[PDB]
Amino acid sequence: TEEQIAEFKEAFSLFDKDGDGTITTKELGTVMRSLGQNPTEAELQDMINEVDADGNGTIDFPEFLTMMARKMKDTDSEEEIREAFRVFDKDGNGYISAAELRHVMTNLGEKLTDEEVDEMIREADIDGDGQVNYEEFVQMMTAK
């Protein structure tokens, strides 16, 4: 962790286009739009509402470091993703077919690209059958 705690702060204040210790939530709506997102101001104010645990909106990484210091791979956020398959499960066992996973992948929430969702179920359907099991996916999401 000693080799990443220095150069990350170069990207932390990179959105403000200056040297100030600011996460720049007002300028994040221009930085992400320059990247090609262009969100609304309601979702933009919702970003640092839970990302920045301080509460101001622009920070010298109390929680911008803690956002990096949350690996999202241990057993505290591995069952919450495993519950997201359970909302789609019918008749138990994690039955989810490639057709049903493509049906739910390109339709709801924040949709993926077709070049992403076409190959997303590829490593989770190595047997080629009609059941993309959740345990074969969270094992791929174990390093996420």
Binding site: R86, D89, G92, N93
Partner: peptide, 21 residues
């Protein structure tokens, strides 16, 4: 009256996934 699984929503699955281990 077909929505009567509203006390045992996750309970029918939380035993079977335990049973598979």
């Amino acid at each position: 009256i077909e929505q009567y699984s509203q006390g045992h929503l996750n309970l029918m699955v939380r035993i079977k996934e335990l049973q598979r281990r």
